[PDB]
Every structure is written in structure tokens, then in C-alpha cells.
Symmetry: C3
Subunit: 145 residues, 3 copies
């Protein structure tokens, strides 16, 4: 319908406005079709997953250098490491996304991972590099939508 087109125009405009306000005020970061945001809290891995899922999203995980840089900027902004959305396989050294798929893009800090299976989780340093670590530390909660 000619009216359907105009209705969609207004809808898209309003979305742009709301997303623009959130972006301008630093409430969220947009990279491609992914949106990253934090509540500023520092809690453990399980708690982060819960906070994100409750908000309708998921604990963040970078799959491209650009996405990695975005999360890194948030970690730097709050000066704290960030737990990423991935866990170690049965075979130490190998990690998978929470959906089970094997991790593709990686940005390990030189020498990592080397937890020998004792560090199932992955944290991001403020410079963007990763380190396998235990899952009970308090880390900045960053979600992706």
C-alpha cells in the first residue's frame, strides 16, 4: 500500500531517532547490525549472562576486529576487564561460543590461552587482547543485542 510505505517511513525515522539519542549519550555502541551496552556493573560470568538474557540480549562476544575494538573501548571506558561470551571445550586450548560453535576470530594476548583447562572463561584486557581465566571474578557486564 502507498500508506504502508509512508507508515514504514515514519517507523524507521522514529527508530533512527531513538537509536541516535542512545548513541549520542553513550548508552550503547553500534557496530554493523550489533549493539553493545553495559549497565556498568562488575560481576561474575554466570551473573552477566543472566543480566544480558533478562534484558533480551546475550553476553557480548566479538566476531570481528571492529566488534572487538568496540567492546575494548567500553572496557577502557570503565577501566575493567570484560568477560566474553565463550567457554573452553573439553580439550583445553579450544573454545566455543555459548551456542556450541567453535570460536573463529580470536585476539589472544601473546602466550594465551595457557590455563591448561583450569580457566574455562575468557576475559578481555583493556587493550582488547584476551586471556583465558576462571569464571568467578568480577568483570564488567557487557551485552550485545
Amino acid at each position: 500500500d502507498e500508506e504502508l510505505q509512508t507508515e514504514l517511513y515514519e517507523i524507521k525515522h522514529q527508530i533512527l531517532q531513538t537509536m541516535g539519542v542512545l548513541s549520542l549519550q553513550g548508552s550503547m555502541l553500534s557496530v554493523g547490525d550489533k549493539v553493545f551496552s553495559t549497565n556498568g556493573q562488575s560481576v561474575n560470568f554466570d551473573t552477566i549472562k543472566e543480566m544480558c538474557t533478562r534484558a533480551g540480549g546475550n553476553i557480548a562476544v566479538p566476531r570481528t576486529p571492529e566488534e572487538n575494538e568496540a567492546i575494548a573501548s567500553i572496557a577502557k571506558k570503565y577501566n575493567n576487564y570484560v568477560y566474553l561470551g565463550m567457554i573452553e571445550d573439553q580439550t583445553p586450548g579450544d573454545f566455543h561460543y555459548l551456542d556450541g560453535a567453535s570460536v573463529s576470530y580470536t585476539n589472544w594476548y601473546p602466550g594465551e590461552p595457557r590455563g591448561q583447562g583450569k580457566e574455562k572463561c575468557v576475559e578481555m584486557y583493556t587493550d582488547g587482547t584476551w586471556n583465558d581465566r576462571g569464571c568467578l571474578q568480577y568483570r564488567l557486564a557487557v551485552c550485545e543485542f
Copy 2:
């Protein structure tokens, strides 16, 4: 159209993202299809209605236990009673929503209401129970959209 379907997908995704960010940061609470939010201000009944209507919403009113609990959490978060969207009928003891319909769900604190017609408004204690009270007190402004 095949293009209409994809366009709608993106629109729905963006809405999820914006709602997710607002939710994650505690800017609003979602219960079913209703959204509750506050500006943190404590003013009287008439002022609250104005603030909500100006924002495109209405002074909040719970119609289910779950909705009641949501508003109660906000009242507890700011440690202040909340005026609800309802007023006393001509017949003391009977209350109606601002649209005129008789109140169905209620959660009166034991013994309430007992203002004998001198307390036309309804405030929510931080534990979620209600009390009929005058409309000139300063209460947390909670709106529903």
C-alpha cells in the same frame, strides 16, 4: 512482499536493541506489553499525570500481581511511596481507574481503604500494598506506556 518481510525483520531487531539497552540500564521495566518508568521526581498526583501524559504515557496503575510487583520494585528502589492511577468514587470505599472503569485487581494494606471519602487518591507503600490517601503529597512519579 519478500522485501517487506526483511524490512520488518530489521525494524523488529532494532526495537529489540533499543528496548534491551533501556532495560539493561534500568531506565524502564517491562511486564507483558506494559512498560513502567520513572523520572525520579516526587510530586503530587496532578503533577504526575501531567508528566506522564506529556511523555506519551499515563500515571501507572497495576492490574495484575506481576504489574504490582514491578511498580513496587521501583518504589523500593527510590525508597518512596508511589501514587497510582485511580481515584475514589462518589461512594467512599469504591475506586475507579482514570477512564472511569471500576478497579478490579487490588492490594490494599490490611484495613485500607478507610479514608471515609477524605482520601480520594491511592498510594503504594514500598512493600507493594496500597493505602487511600490525599492527593497533595509528594510521591514518586511512575508512568506506564
Copy 3:
């Protein structure tokens, strides 16, 4: 489709909810189909344009008295002048929007503009009136979407 209509209803409702929350909390101001918002930062003209464009919007510019009043309220809220989206033509005294079109609506403070071509930018005083000024001062960044 009957389903397309219902899907659109929900979409429009959600947008109203998100816009309502942003409005209630003072994150943005809505005037007609235009949305104004600020990140609270005070920087020069070029920096403001960049901040706005990066957020998906543009440095604000009022085209009606109502739009002017909205921006003025933000300037007053933060107690700081606001750079507007317009620059002086080659012919001193004449200004155009950043798209090149000649400025229509104006609200110059009595006597302005009188920079004689040395003040290419336009700033808004907290009372809403304008003054042509250099573009290197630090002014409140207000964007429109």
C-alpha cells in the same frame, strides 16, 4: 495482511514506549517530527557536527519558533550557548543551512548579526536569541534527529 496490521500495531506501540521513556527522563525533546538531544558536552562547531553525524543525526537548527524554544530550553538547562546548524555566506550578513539553502526563520538578538564576515558561525543565547560568532568557542552540543 490482517497479520501485517497487528504486527505494525505492536511495532508502533513499542516505539511509543521507548520514545516515552527517553522523553520522561529528559534524554530528548520532541517537537513535531524532530527530536533534539545533547550529550552535555561543550566543544567547538566542527566537533559538534562530528558528534551528531556519528550518532546518525545533525547539529541542531531551529526552523520554527517552537523548535527554537526547544533548543533554548536545553541551552538554559545546561546554562551554556549552543552552536546552530548554519554558516555565513560569502556576502556577510547572509546565512545558509549546512545544505546550502538560505536561512528562513531567524531570531537574532537585537543588532545581530554584525560580525562583518569575521563571525561565520551562529550561537544561541540562553534566552533563545542568536548571535553570529566565531566557530572555535566551546558550546553545548545539541543534535537533531
